[PDB]
């Protein structure tokens, strides 16, 4: 066994020497002559109220009006953030739901939590309500994030150290993604739906190819549990958020942390991370009851979105990148713009 | 507002009317987290209570007309730092202890240090159940297992003056009983700082009063929360 492990260390030594020789410059000095982002003042236009417990997760719709929000009361509420209306309410079997996704067709909403089941909800039903379209089961851990690929395929990150691509029409795993040694908290799909990064609690993020179920490449540099991960808008980079009060930007072509977003006054844990439509304003979401807005190229705060009363569990930017919805553990969601 | 907008604002208000009806259900039920070890009688505390009154099992019991949800974990893994944050607004935590065994008490104490001090599991009180008192009673009278080996502070210890021994109990058993409580209470009375409280109870396996013990403790918890709303505590 010791021949295997020492071989594994010198592969880590070969990778780290390859990454060190790959870094001729850094993003701090490539972007040191561009104009500063300035102060981005940003306030709440819509305080979406009506939840009964902590808003654990949300997901925007692709039309940038509809959003679903998951809470620990056993409800998914579909919201119209333009008018504060409640488009739908979805009661659940389990009130411990840790994620929800909005499909990019408007036809389905997933949810999943400690019940170890991804429940797909059919919204556009002829009979006139929401029902359980599919109880996707097979995981042996809590589902922490799920995202719809296109209308019949979903990848679910779970607490059994695995990610899994599921066919909703059959209920089965087409492919399974294994390799993480810890709890997997978040996943993010690239904007051509062929690769996805998963951030887990082993201080590493793995890029997976969804088409044959393998890990391309593993990204280290974090030093605690990654609770948040989000792709850059082009698809060549991704940022991460974790408990070490740092956010780190990882390019998929050159495997390094190009920038750490970390001040000394911040001591808490990042729970949610999402970029803008251009990837200039990395909005992160922390445990200091606040949402700091980082410049993604210069490592300075552009403003703090401070309107919440507990941990901001979820944070999402629209697909036209124009409103930010931050949901917290105080049962309120807030539309910043 | 248009004709379809004003009916959509109404359809929000019927979802207000449904969720205010479900807020009546949610506030009148009290979520409790059953988190104990495998050696302990955690399944017995499920079984005894539900007759009298999947990664989550859910036990509901009704004592004096009020609702009491109890959740314990099944298929969840042994890593317990990310899913434990979901139970931050539960009314109480039932920490069932196998007090009779001694090689796994300190593992339960380090479990108890982790729950009591956590930044999101703070403000949650713990209803401490110290199960297997009947087999602890047989073991101390047998005298096979020496507590002094595992804990070298059972030698300079004496039984407290405020102790309440049940009749027909040997003094060594009562000394063994209240030692395990005081190991479990100097964890709790060192970092809470009047934010949450520990309620220790010496319970038998087949005892039929654990619902009343939870209800008497849960009455205190929501009393103390209401005093903090006037800052009385």
């Amino acid at each position, epitope marked *: 066994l010791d021949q295997l492990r020492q071989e594994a260390e010198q592969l880590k030594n070969q990778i780290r020497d390859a990454r060190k020789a790959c870094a001729d410059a850094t993003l701090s000095q490539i972007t040191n002559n561009i104009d500063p982002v300035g102060r981005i003042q940003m306030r709440t236009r819509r305080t979406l109220r009506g939840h009964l417990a902590k808003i654990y997760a949300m997901h925007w719709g692709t039309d940038s*009006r*509809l959003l679903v929000s998951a809470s620990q009361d056993g409800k998914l509420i579909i919201w*119209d953030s333009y*008018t504060t*209306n409640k*488009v*739908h309410a979805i009661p659940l079997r389990s009130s411990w739901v840790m994620t929800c996704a909005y499909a990019p067709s*408007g036809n389905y909403v997933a949810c999943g939590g400690l019940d170890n089941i991804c429940s797909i909800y059919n919204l*556009k039903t*002829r*009979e*006139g*309500n929401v029902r359980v379209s599919r109880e996707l089961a097979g995981h042996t851990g809590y589902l922490s994030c799920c995202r719809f690929l296109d209308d019949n395929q979903i990848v679910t990150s779970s607490g059994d150290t695995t990610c899994a691509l599921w066919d909703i029409e059959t209920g089965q795993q087409t492919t399974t993604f294994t390799g993480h040694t810890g709890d997997v908290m978040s996943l993010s799909l690239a904007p051509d739906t062929r690769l996805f990064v998963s951030g887990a609690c082993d201080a590493s993020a793995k890029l997976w190819d969804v088409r044959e179920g393998m890990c391309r490449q593993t990204f280290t540099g974090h030093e605690s549990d990654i609770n948040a991960i989000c792709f850059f808008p082009n698809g060549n980079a991704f940022a991460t958020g974790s408990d070490d009060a740092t956010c780190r930007l990882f390019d998929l072509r050159a495997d390094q942390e190009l920038m750490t977003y970390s001040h000394d006054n911040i001591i808490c844990g990042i729970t949610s991370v999402s970029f803008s439509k251009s990837g200039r304003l990395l909005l992160a979401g922390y445990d200091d009851f606040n949402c700091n807005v980082w410049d993604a190229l210069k490592a300075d705060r552009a403003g703090v979105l401070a309107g919440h009363d507990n941990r901001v569990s979820c944070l999402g930017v629209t697909d036209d990148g124009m409103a930010v919805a931050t949901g917290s553990w105080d049962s309120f969601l807030k539309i910043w713009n | 507002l*248009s*004709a*379809e*907008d004003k*009916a*959509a604002v*109404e*359809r929000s*208000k*019927m979802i207000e*009317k449904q969720l205010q009806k479900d807020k009546q259900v949610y506030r009148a039920t009290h979520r409790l987290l059953l988190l104990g070890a495998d050696n302990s009688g955690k399944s017995t505390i499920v079984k005894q209570m539900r007759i009298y009154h999947s990664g989550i099992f859910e036990t509901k019991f009704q004592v004096d007309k009020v609702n009491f949800h109890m959740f314990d974990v099944g298929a969840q893994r042994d890593e317990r730092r990310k899913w434990i944050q979901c139970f931050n607004d539960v009314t109480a935590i039932i920490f069932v202890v196998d007090s009779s065994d001694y090689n796994r008490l300190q593992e339960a104490l380090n479990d108890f240090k982790s729950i009591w001090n956590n930044r999101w599991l703070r403000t949650i009180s713990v209803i401490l159940f110290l199960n297997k008192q009947d087999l602890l009673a047989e073991k101390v009278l047998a005298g096979k297992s020496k507590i002094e080996d595992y804990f070298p502070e059972f030698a300079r210890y004496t039984t407290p003056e405020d102790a309440t021994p049940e009749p027909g109990e040997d003094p060594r058993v009562t000394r063994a009983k209240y030692f395990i409580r005081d190991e479990f209470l100097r964890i709790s009375t060192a970092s809470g700082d009047g934010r949450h409280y520990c309620y220790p109870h010496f319970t038998c396996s087949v005892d039929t009063e654990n619902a009343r013990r939870i209800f008497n403790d849960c009455r205190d918890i929501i009393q103390r929360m209401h005093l903090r709303q006037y800052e009385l505590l």
Partner: single-chain antibody
Amino acid sequence: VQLVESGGGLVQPGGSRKLSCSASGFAFSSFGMHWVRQAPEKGLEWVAYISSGSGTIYYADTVKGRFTISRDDPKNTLFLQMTSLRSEDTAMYYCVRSIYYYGSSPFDFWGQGTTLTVSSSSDIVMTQATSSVPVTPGESVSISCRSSKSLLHSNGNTYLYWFLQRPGQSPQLLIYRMSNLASGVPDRFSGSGSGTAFTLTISRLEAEDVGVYYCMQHLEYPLTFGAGTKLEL
């Protein structure tokens, strides 16, 4: 999803008849439901609307003080009690299903009809000027529509709905809110317009699309329907 109607017959003038449409196949409390009547050799004219979980009761001008519409949510039945029936009441009345939210499909399912034979301004005129059109299978026909007042609200949704009434069948929703396509409709149908003037375009006209085509305004509360555009062969 079935909306079968009861009641209706040979009612003497000045009388009173109660019409009930039963709903087996969809949830009743989630849908705000209308009554639309069809005169024997004329068009469609809306008479009533009750919201889901009744809060606002809208009637037309000619049926305002004389008709009442009520809603029985447990028994899945929609009631229309009528008083003082004039001859014009003569018509076959449709039970109409409609939900209202963002992206919803109002007027999607219509009933079947119940024949009622009575014996011997602010309203938006939805003019059509398209009584008849000689059509052949395969060509691309255009059906015109004009409104007296502009239907483009400040939201951005222009409230124009299209219906297809087959000769021995109920009307069926084709496109709603100007051009939103309905679920069972083929991709042949397409809608356009500019707020006041409107256009429906059938591009690959088949045999089953024979019928009278109706327009709609859902902007103003009193709904009005067009005279009809008959695509005869």
